[PDB]
Design a protein around this ligand. Structure first.
Ligand SMILES: [Ca+2]
Ligand SMILES: [Ca+2]
Length: 279
């Protein structure tokens, strides 16, 4: 399948080179996989989700995404026009408030929730969790992300937007999950992206068009935008049977575009998520 005039990030993950405009992807599109978006929620009614999104848990008064961030990330995972895995199922877990903030204990609870809740869902091609969030280092947040990964969920987490070493941020610093840095459409590390030995992979993160609340769309930037590219690609590759939740991050790194990025500090991987799609 080919989506013409796609958002640059979708084009980038299906090309060995920057500057293309078509998103080439296998039509299975993540069907049969499930991605939990742990964030401000998901506006499931957005026409771009086509019925495939639902809220499953909130830690606040409403399940409504009153911010847009979680809707945007969910759209990059799996919306029709803006998504990597256009046929995946999306489950929203609202651990962040409508200002985009959330206490670590609530974020931990939401990770534990996904580890259990997945056992009640029919996700035959496997389960992914996209965590476009984080703050300062916390061993308990890291442990929660490690548990979620251990339970059988492919966990993708943002590296953080501090232009600093991700070792000081969580859950970015948890080794066992897939920590995602951000790049721009010219294949530079995004100016804000964290870096460091713990990063596993980079994804498109600067000027990412996706769904927004109110049935709208907008472009925003962050490692929060790169993370759902990788979560969606994992779902896509799991549906293709090329990898599993336990091994998807390593598979994505070993099939990434290598050395294409600039302003990567020595000791940080130079790997850009790539679907390797061949018609
Ligand atoms: Ca290249
Ligand atoms: Ca890792």
């Amino acid at each position: 399948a080919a989506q013409t005039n796609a958002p640059w990030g979708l084009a980038r993950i299906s090309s060995t080179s920057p500057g293309t405009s078509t998103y080439y992807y296998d039509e299975s599109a993540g069907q049969g996989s499930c991605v939990y978006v742990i964030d401000t929620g998901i506006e499931a009614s957005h026409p771009e989700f086509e019925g495939r999104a639902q809220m499953v848990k909130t830690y606040y008064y409403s399940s409504r995404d009153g911010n847009g961030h979680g809707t945007h990330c969910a759209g990059t995972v799996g919306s029709r026009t803006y998504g990597v895995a256009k046929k995946t199922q999306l489950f929203g877990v609202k651990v962040l408030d409508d200002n985009g903030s959330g206490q670590y204990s609530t974020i931990i609870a939401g990770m534990d929730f996904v580890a259990s809740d997945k056992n009640n869902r029919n996700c035959p091609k496997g389960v992914v969790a996209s965590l476009s969030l984080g703050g300062g280092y916390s061993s308990s947040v890291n442990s929660a992300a490690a548990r979620l990964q251990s339970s059988g969920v492919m966990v993708a987490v943002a590296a953080g937007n501090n232009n600093a070493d991700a070792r000081n941020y969580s859950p970015a610093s948890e080794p066992s999950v897939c920590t995602v840095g951000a790049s721009d459409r010219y294949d530079r590390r995004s100016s804000f992206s964290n870096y460091g030995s713990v990063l596993d992979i980079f994804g498109p993160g600067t000027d990412i068009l996706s769904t927004w609340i109110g049935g709208s769309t907008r472009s925003i930037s962050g490692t929060s935008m790169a993370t759902p590219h990788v979560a969606g690609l994992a779902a896509y590759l799991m549906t293709l049977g090329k990898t599993t939740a336990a091994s998807a991050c390593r598979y994505i790194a070993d099939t990434a575009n290598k050395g294409d990025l600039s302003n990567i500090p020595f000791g940080t991987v130079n790997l850009l998520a790539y679907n390797n799609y061949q018609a």
